[PDB]
Amino acid sequence: MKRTWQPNRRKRAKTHGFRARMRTPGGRKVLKRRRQKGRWRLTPAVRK
Amino acid sequence: AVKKFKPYTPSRRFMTVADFSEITKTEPEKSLVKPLKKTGGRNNQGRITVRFRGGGHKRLYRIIDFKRWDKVGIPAKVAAIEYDPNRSARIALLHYVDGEKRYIIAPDGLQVGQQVVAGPDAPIQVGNALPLRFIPVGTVVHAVELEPKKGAKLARAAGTSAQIQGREGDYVILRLPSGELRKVHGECYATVGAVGNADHKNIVLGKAGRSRWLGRRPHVRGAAMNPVDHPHGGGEGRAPRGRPPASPWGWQTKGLKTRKRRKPSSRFIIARRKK
RNA sequence: GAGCUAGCCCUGGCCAGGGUGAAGCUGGGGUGAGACCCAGUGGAGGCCCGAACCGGUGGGGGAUGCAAACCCCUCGGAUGA
RNA sequence: GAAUGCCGGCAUGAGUAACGAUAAAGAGGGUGAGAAUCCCUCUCGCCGUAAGCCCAAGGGUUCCUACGCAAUGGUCGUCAGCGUAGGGUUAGGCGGGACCUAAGGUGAAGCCGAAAGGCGUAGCCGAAGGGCAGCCGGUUAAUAUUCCGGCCCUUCCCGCAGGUGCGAUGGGGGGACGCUCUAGGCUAGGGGGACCGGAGCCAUGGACGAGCCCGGCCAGAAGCGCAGGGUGGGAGGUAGGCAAAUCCGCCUCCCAACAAGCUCUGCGUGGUGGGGAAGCCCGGGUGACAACCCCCCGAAGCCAGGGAGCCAAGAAAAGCCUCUAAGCACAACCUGCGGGAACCCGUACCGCAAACCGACACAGGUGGGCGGGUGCAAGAGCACUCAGGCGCGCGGGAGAACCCUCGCCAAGGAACUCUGCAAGUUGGCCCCGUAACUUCGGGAGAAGGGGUGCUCCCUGGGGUGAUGAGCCCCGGGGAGCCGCAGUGAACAGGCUCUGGCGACUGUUUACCAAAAACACAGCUCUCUGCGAACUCGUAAGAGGAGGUAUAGGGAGCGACGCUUGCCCGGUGCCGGAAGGUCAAGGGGAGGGGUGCAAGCCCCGAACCGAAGCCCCGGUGAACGGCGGCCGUAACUAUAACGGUCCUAAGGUAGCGAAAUUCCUUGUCGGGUAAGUUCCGACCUGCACGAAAAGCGUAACGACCGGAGCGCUGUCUCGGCGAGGGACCCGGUGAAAUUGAACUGGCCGUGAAGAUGCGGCCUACCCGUGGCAGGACGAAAAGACCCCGUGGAGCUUUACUGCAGCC
RNA sequence: CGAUGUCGGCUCGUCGCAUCCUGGGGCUGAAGAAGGUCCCAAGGGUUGGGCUGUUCGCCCAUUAAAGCGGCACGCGAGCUG
RNA sequence: UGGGAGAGGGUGGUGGAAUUCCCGGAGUAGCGGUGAAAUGCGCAGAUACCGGGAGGAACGCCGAUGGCGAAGGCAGCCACCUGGUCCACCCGUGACGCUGAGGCGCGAAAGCGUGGGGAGCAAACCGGAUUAGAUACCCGGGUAGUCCACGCCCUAAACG
RNA sequence: CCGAGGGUAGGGCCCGUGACUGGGGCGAAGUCGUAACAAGGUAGCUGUACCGGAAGGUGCGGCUGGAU
């Protein structure tokens, strides 16, 4: 049957992407926290 | 003269449709239509604020002239009468001797080819617009401004009309379509005659799909829901109201008056509505 | 977090084939004029049968499954909410 | 040493289940250390509205080639979507961008909010919508509308020529639109040919034939032809299109009109360039100077912005054309021609799947296009087949029980069972025929029946063409032939009678309920005069609605028919400028603290003083409620009638043992041999009743009762047969569970149901196929139940607050 | 209560005897035949239907008879639901 | 052909009297109602009086023992559209007539459907009386309906 | 071929019968009231409509076959 993950590149970048995060107080705290934790990726990878 | 159907389906049994007799032109004036943005009853927050809306036929908004004192003394010819999906009344296309073209609400009895005119001197004739003060007492009238230069507000639905009952200072006394007696300022414009298409109320929709074409989505009763949804919700089996009948938001809904108490226009309402 | 699901908005797309035969129109009949009757034409409809498509009625299988909802047979809708 | 402890390691179950669709395999030849599993050939089977082909998404080198097989592959492996290396994706025209705008997002102006932030016109962003110039063939191991070949085309720059009042983000036109049905003419695609081209073939009894088999085109600029779309021309006035306007709109006049002309597409033709089969020989070569022609069928595609009808009344903006404004008319723009210029990103491969989403090479899920032929009435249905693609990554045997899916069955035919659950029957098409009832549509495919193949003969009408022949479509009559059987295979209703419920088509508990539930047209009450009510928001702002009482919100009822009675004392709501009560505040009689005193400071009675409540009324399709005892008629029984108590008023019509009836299988009648169910009645209705509607109702229903006919393996009552498993052999090899175990019956005992204690009995050691009585067998720290001064959802005239409203 | 699945049915039995039948008896208000009552006896047997979920029971047609109880109201790692 | 009388019919208009309600004024202790009363209304200011407004329905006098129509039935006034009827003249047609089963149309009230309207009146219904009772007669309220438009129903002591 | 008739299925009319139910006629001395006949004590009758144990009552319009 139809499962929950139905990948869509534009959806991904526009929902979790670097620019969506920067535009919003909570999204900037996400970036701040993932930088402090030392993550190799601050934001999900999508081809674009 | 609503049209019946033969019972060749269960729904056609009761369905009636408007006769569309007065209609003389079946596509609208391209320079006078604009897109009508459907809302679904959602506001600028995206939240439903008027339940059960959406999914109706696409429509174009026809720009209507609810001022008419725009063009005092300039006569126009009634070029066509057309179907307007955005309102119950039909509309009339006016060709002004100006060359300017405009839509007005089509009063009852208005004929293609006749001439209408607006202004303090206009003859008392069906389709002409004058300030209320110059219209003789007793005249049945429609598309009435409520404050000078603010636009026709009252008596616009199919078949409605207001009747001029008397004068008092700068004001005239109108019997609105609801039966309320109200003072309306004398400089307020109005159009002689009643709104047309008076059979509109005798239309039987006939089936549930017809409501859906108009953007009416199914309305669900309070007594059909649960207590988390509605004062009438819950209960084992069917249940009577079990409390004073209430809206979903909990206010009483059989009798409870709702006009604001200290509203300034109370000084201008003579008598509240009837029947 | 509405890439699942629920509603709505914008813009596109899809619905083999067959059946029934509304109004209207035409002619004929009818009458003072009519209503109306008959025939032809016509092609309406949350109309009928049935694939795609959307479903999920009954039974059987499966039950450390092919599958954390599947399979077979049967069955509902299929121009419409 | 225990925490169903934590982390790791290793056991048991066990060589056990399983190895993932029952579309299917056999052999020969090769390679290699090794071959059911890789390569090649022949035979066989499966898909073929796909299990074939092309896009899009998503994936991201999986593509091609060489060299490999430790691991990955449910076995094997020499193979591979795997390991290593090298190679591979070529664009002005295809898609996106340097173009447009849609929802929506964002947002100079502006508005709002403790902060963060929320809005917001224009503007900007935003596409699978608008718009815009490339077709056919060849080539690579791997890309191609991209390279090459042929023939075409677009924009930008500059120049020459000719023409023009040139010029815009501004004005206007246009772009520009729905649903169903549909005409003419075409093309795609397909069928046939006794005609044209072709390697060959004559078998096994016959055929050297008007035999068999194979093929018989594709693209193309100008010009021309056919078929269509778009479109009036002139003049005068002009105050409207937020400046101007010769444009557009409006009025008038003349002319033109089912045309024509101008214009633009589609199709045909077309210089020219391509392609080209079987067979045979080794992807190639030949065939081949290949031929490339005629007839028929024919789109849902094209001409297109076509026509008609209908109501529910069907985006925007740019490109483009026209108008003028500043400006400039040495310019600038239009047309023709020439040379130059033309950027960025994608392009491999998978793509109904072993490369995407499901932890797996997972029987599930995934949008668009093409989807051939024959027959079956049609068709994308069904059977077989083309092109193309596959045999589903464990096999070999055996022919037990038992299971699954399947076939048949003597006599009987629902006796089965909660239930005809299941499975039979019926089954398409043509014709005959068809009941109660009905809202006149329907019920209806009612029911029930007859026909259905093949051959010869005669004959009717239509399409194409020519009116004819040929091809093709729909038939009508007569005479025959064969079989058990002619929709001969496959796909394809069992029917009727009568109740309950819901009018109906719809909707629902994704994943145990599809229903009588929800919705529904329709009915009623109620609020709302517009900066509406109401809803979201602290607000600004939104929705309501660019609507205006024939409208909008709320509530109940639920098509339709006939109807919807009595009670306003309580609660609600509505009305009521009196009266009563009532907060802050006003007032300050009269007190008090302090000071020498002026004074300062404090308490404070009457009185005035809102909504709310009290009080007076109204109101039921507002919340709701609609009696008890006793007596009475000339047989009896029973009470039309009376008495009395109580109430705000005492349940009317209609219905009733009911989806409601406890006693209950009430009683009677029907149906049956027999009927706790069913249907019809009766009425002492435990405990119906009138919009939480009452009683009916044609049609409708995968709803739930009851009966009958048809037919059956449901059953008496089982038997046989098929295949996939089970079983045996080779390969790979799990699981929950498990204190340890050397783990028998009885009668007792024991914490009350003992392999483990007592007494007796019985019993050589160890497995394999089976069955499930026990191990109070496994699983999940019982969902019931209680307990905890545990939790959470819900309610209200519980308490106390808060939003909101007054 | 860190779970002993709970009615009825189906299937499969097995046991007790306070015996429904069949076999053997005594008494009888036992003429015969047919009964009644009690004693011994558990070897075998103890039907098919209509109604209801039913156990039970009532009814139809038979019969030698249409027995009553236990086995976790025997039996869901055997089935039904 | 020339004339006449008439509430004959249909449409559109329109006038005054009265009732009811509303607003303003003035005024106070009852009004109403009956056989008599009570319910009811009234100091929250009624009744009675004056001015203003809204709305529906019916047309006083003329009016008669009258007129018109086939009947049902028709009454302020105006205009339009339309039927019947009588008289005079003695002009035209030349028996073209009478009746009439079926058919068709009209048809008071009440009632029905769909809209609207609603002052007065008033089935049902509620209350006050009366009465043995009083589901009546009398009194106070009051919903259909009475009115309009269209469509039905088709009855009558539709009688002379 | 036709064909008596037999079978299958579905219709039409008539008769008989049926739990129960509807009203009707009739029957020496039942119960309730008193609607009509006199102005019958509310003149009666009437078509229709609604209501009531019953006769009846009331609304609307009509008749005199009404009295004074």
Ligand SMILES: *C(=O)[C@H](CCSC)NC=O
């Ligand atoms: C009683 O029947 C009980 C009910 C469980 S589900 C409500 N069962 C076992 O306790």
Ligand SMILES: [Mg+2]
């Ligand atoms: Mg899903």
Ligand SMILES: [Mg+2]
């Ligand atoms: Mg998705």
Ligand SMILES: [Mg+2]
């Ligand atoms: Mg995307």
Ligand SMILES: [Mg+2]
């Ligand atoms: Mg996308």
Ligand SMILES: [Mg+2]
């Ligand atoms: Mg997206």
Ligand SMILES: [Mg+2]
């Ligand atoms: Mg976002």
Ligand SMILES: [Mg+2]
């Ligand atoms: Mg982003």
Ligand SMILES: [Mg+2]
């Ligand atoms: Mg911040």
Ligand SMILES: [Mg+2]
């Ligand atoms: Mg933070």
Ligand SMILES: [Mg+2]
């Ligand atoms: Mg990481």
Ligand SMILES: [Mg+2]
């Ligand atoms: Mg790094």
Ligand SMILES: [Mg+2]
């Ligand atoms: Mg992130």
Ligand SMILES: [Mg+2]
């Ligand atoms: Mg109709």
Ligand SMILES: [Mg+2]
């Ligand atoms: Mg009809």
Ligand SMILES: [Mg+2]
């Ligand atoms: Mg119209």
